Structure formats: C-alpha cells, structure tokens
Amino acid sequence: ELQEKLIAVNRVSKTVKGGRIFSFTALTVVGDGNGRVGFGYGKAREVPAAIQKAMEKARRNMINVALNNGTLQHPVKGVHTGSRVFMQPASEGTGIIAGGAMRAVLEVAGVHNVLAKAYGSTNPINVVRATIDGLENMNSPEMVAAKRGK
RNA sequence: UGAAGAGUUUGAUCAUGGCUCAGAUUGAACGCUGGCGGCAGGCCUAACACAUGCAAGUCGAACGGUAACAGGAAGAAG
C-alpha cells in the first residue's frame, strides 16, 4: 500500500506570441508507512493530469528512511534553496508537530512522532526537498556501528 | 513530554524582504445578551482637592482622688 497526498497546485503561465497560455503544476508525496517516501512534481494543461503526472513522478524516486519506531533516529537538519528544516524525534503520543509539506512528507513516510520546524523560505517544493533530504541522510545505529565500531 | 504556519510584489518564477492573520494572556474597557452558585479580584488615571463618621488606646492591682452612676453607713423626716 502507498499513501498518496497532494501538497500544492498552482497556475503557472507563459506569455505566448499573442496572449498568454496557462499550465498547472502539482506537488505530490507518496510513501508507505514503513520509511519510504518520494515526491513528484508534474505540470499539465489541466489540474488532474498535473496531479497524475506528479503521482507517477512520486512513485518512482522513492527513498528509504531508517525510522526508529514511528519517530526519527536523531535530530536532523535539511536545506534546499534557502529552506532550512529541523526535525527531531518526539515521545509516543506526540503527533506530527510539523507544518505544511513537512506534515505531509512525515505522514506518508510513516512517521508519527516528530517535532519539526521549517526556517527559510517555506516554498513547498523546496521544503519538501529539504525534508526528503534530511530524512535520507539520517543514520540508524546499525550503519553507524557498521561504519565505525561495534 | 518539547518547537505547525498562511496571505500579499510577478505575465509567470525563485529568492529577499517587510506588512497582515491564525495563539496565549489582562487589575481591562466598550457593544449586544444575561440564570444559580463557589472561589477570587475591583482607581492602572489626579502623590488631585477633600464635607461626615469611624481607624489607638488602656491601666484604680502606680496616685491624689470621687465628678458622675450604683451601692453601704448613717443623720433628719414623713
């Protein structure tokens, strides 16, 4: 099973020889609640095709997150194009205390106990890239022990 | 046990960046409405000016006393 959810959609335009034509972009995140998430960004002349193109973009480009138990291994930082996010693990029963694209990425990826904030520009494309980036760089004790000690 | 963001500059973009909004609070005030209780709070302004009453007495077991009250001892009377 893969959770789906749209983040945002807007109505980019382009000035043509005569008037000005229109498109739509949609940003979607896909995951399974077991530490895999991916985002997608499709453009189309109409919203539903933009959303679908986004969803197939998102079902490829799935990463692996090394979750702990529904929360994060350790506090993690992410940046992308002037968008800095901070996630840290929480206690059980603490929800997804997260913002916009933060909440959606953390949800579909299978996190339940996070404590997140986004600092720079909160443009969803960039905050979702920042969040995915932070999550994919997270270390669990297994690989850190593997890479250095026991 | 602990941390959410949104809107607005462009034909559109991404940054910057301000403005504005969603929260909590109060010795509050105002507007509309108003049943009961419990518990609390109530001049933030003019350390402005103040009528009236009250807010510091008590002790005769310190003292001369004995005004005043009530008693005693009488006296003189009915």
The owner of tokens 């000005």 is A20
How far apart CA A91 and CA A63 sit, in angstroms, is 25
Distance in Å from B63's C1' to A122's CA comes to 95
Read off the amino acid at residue A71: T
The owner of tokens 């000035």 is A15
How far apart CA A40 and CA A115 sit, in angstroms, is 24
Other CB atoms within 10 Å distance of the CB of residue A144: 12
> Which residue in A56, A54, A4 sits closest to A25, CA to CA?
A54
Q: Is A54 helix (H, G, I), strand (E, B) or coil?
A: helix
Q: Which residues bind near strand B, taking a CB cut-off of 7 Å?
A: A 10, 12-15, 20, 81-83, 86, 88-94, 97-100, 102-103, 115-118, 120-126
For residue A108, the surrounding DSSP H or E stretch is: helix A101-108
**Is the CA virtual torsion A63, A114, A116, A1 positive or negative?**
positive
Resolution of the structure, angstroms: 2.7
φ, ψ dihedrals at A131, nearest 5°: -70, -50
Judge contact between A19 and A113, C-beta under 8 A. no
